[PDB]
Design a binder for this molecule. Structure first.
Ligand SMILES: COc1ccccc1O[C@H](C)CNC(=O)c1cc(=O)[nH]c2ccc(F)cc12
Ligand SMILES: COc1ccccc1O[C@H](C)CNC(=O)c1cc(=O)[nH]c2ccc(F)cc12
Lengths: 304, 304
């Protein structure tokens, strides 16, 4: 029993972290096979970030201008190319620690672990969720760019995020491993405001199921609702609309606890309307939305 | 910017996890040099757990009864001994992945990362704190015993916890790596209730400093207090008494923000007396106490 914001074991990703320096800028790179992936803004000076023309900036860079260091040893850069907002630095050595991997582009509401790195070195690991406004609420300081987000399925690492920037509001934006930003963000130091950070309803319900499984049941009520009635309340509280797809995904949690999804929706509705009344659920005084239904099942079953 | 419940990168510990089986019981072991450490209750059947005599149970066990598997390969057990509540299984092969390490016994209020494991395999990593009642609020299922808690200082892993049991109240108890339980808990399936789970005051203040550093300042007030006045309020709210040692440890956070420790204590006092009023601090609706002053500095500076 017990429920924690758990991240995947980070070892497989730690073995891929390298340092990339170009001129006076140093950030993190991801070394997989003979390619090192890093944010293209490594070629920019702080002045360039205001209005960078990446293709023009890249013309002044050669293979020898990209310094790649794996631990204390230097990798030889034999090629470089820009794919969207990432640079792919071809090195002459395949990473011997390359795990089985995939590059996946996640949907909002999906969770992942982040291995925060500085100078190619891991500092920590934490669990994130792609917000519905395509930002993440991370913990990143200067030098953290190129730190990656990932999920692990037994021995396969699915990389889904690469950190690129912090918006003026303290929230984070980045790309998938093909260099495409999540959301409308650009790798430029300009006015980029995030949209509404709505709550991931299906995740909150999954977390309420986790609470019931772990003994916290005070919020269970005598009511039920419909998808349309629940959604009227969800709209009022800036919660994402719940679809039949979400109800289907909550099927196994519903089966395990014996609590119908719409009954859990009615519990959630009363919690939204009445608040927690100074009470807690799984040690939290707010409704947690960064656990997917898959995370709840995984944690509650012990998938390794 | 941003503040997260961050765990240490777990790779160095993942390389030490092994599976230990004795009879029909399988749990996790920690392989460091040529010794595998595991909870002594691996020798018990579920029936034995009600009133086990470990010395007597151990007489019926030989080296060949302890099956140790590292990944898919079997380790040869050449010796076994019981130290307090842990078994030390001497194997014929030194773990080639043994990091630099120490065994430390932590004090209540100190935090650590847990690498939850099942069958010698890592499932996830999360950040914990040794509660003032010597329990931890973890996430452990059947088979998680022998999972360890640790801190990392650059390349040295300080192991501080080994998981042994779940109390009937859903909280967790375990030992340091010398096999001594934290608190008064015993490795027996009996009525073991935990004492008062008081709040780790110095950690809450460290977290309030983290909030100020990251932009959340609404709770800062026009007041100050004294250690004795603050402690009268702390006693009323089941917070640990704040000492001058704690004030000294908060010195660097006080210096960084320019907010005197006693002024932050007065902010904390008003938060205890008036509540959050439906507001949040670093995305939490309660006062977080599982970040030490060292964790706040580390996260806010980027120690790798
Ligand atoms: C406005 O910057 C950009 C605009 C678009 C694209 C990239 C930008 O980022 C520049 C290149 C490098 N950024 C960081 O290293 C960085 C990342 C972070 O998440 N938090 C930080 C906190 C403090 C700090 F001094 C720096 C950071
Ligand atoms: C009362 O048990 C003991 C009393 C004293 C000492 C050890 C005991 O633990 C037995 C040997 C094995 N325990 C687990 O595997 C276990 C650990 C956990 O943290 N959560 C669990 C959730 C469900 C479940 F079925 C088992 C566990």
């Amino acid at each position: 029993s017990g429920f924690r914001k758990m991240a995947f074991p980070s070892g497989k990703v730690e073995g891929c972290m390298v340092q990339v320096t170009c001129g006076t800028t140093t950030l993190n790179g991801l070394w997989l096979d003979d390619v090192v992936y890093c944010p293209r803004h490594v070629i920019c000076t702080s002045e360039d970030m205001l209005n960078p023309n990446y293709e023009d900036l890249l013309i002044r860079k050669s293979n020898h201008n990209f310094l790649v260091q794996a631990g204390n040893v230097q990798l030889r850069v034999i090629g470089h190319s820009m794919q969207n907002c990432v640079l792919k630095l071809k090195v002459d050595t395949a990473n011997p620690k390359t795990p089985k991997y995939k590059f996946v582009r996640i949907q909002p509401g999906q969770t992942f672990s982040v291995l925060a790195c500085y100078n190619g070195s891991p500092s920590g690991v934490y669990q994130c969720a792609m917000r519905p406004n395509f930002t993440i609420k991370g913990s990143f300081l200067n030098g953290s760019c190129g730190s990656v987000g990932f999920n692990i399925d037994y021995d396969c690492v699915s990389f889904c995020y690469m950190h690129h920037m912090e918006l003026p509001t303290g929230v984070h934006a980045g790309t998938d491993l093909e260099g495409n930003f999540y959301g409308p963000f650009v790798d430029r130091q300009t006015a980029q405001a995030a949209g509404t950070d709505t709550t991931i309803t299906v995740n909150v319900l999954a977390w309420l199921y986790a609470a019931v499984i772990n003994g916290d049941r005070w919020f269970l009520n005598r009511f039920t609702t419909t998808l349309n009635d629940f959604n009227l309340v969800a709209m009022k509280y800036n919660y994402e609309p719940l679809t039949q797809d979400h109800v289907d995904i909550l099927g196994p949690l519903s089966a395990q606890t014996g609590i119908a999804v719409l009954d859990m929706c009615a519990s959630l509705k009363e919690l939204l309307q009445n608040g927690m009344n100074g009470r807690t659920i799984l040690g939290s005084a707010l409704l947690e939305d960064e656990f997917t239904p898959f995370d709840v099942v995984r944690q509650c079953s012990g998938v390794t």
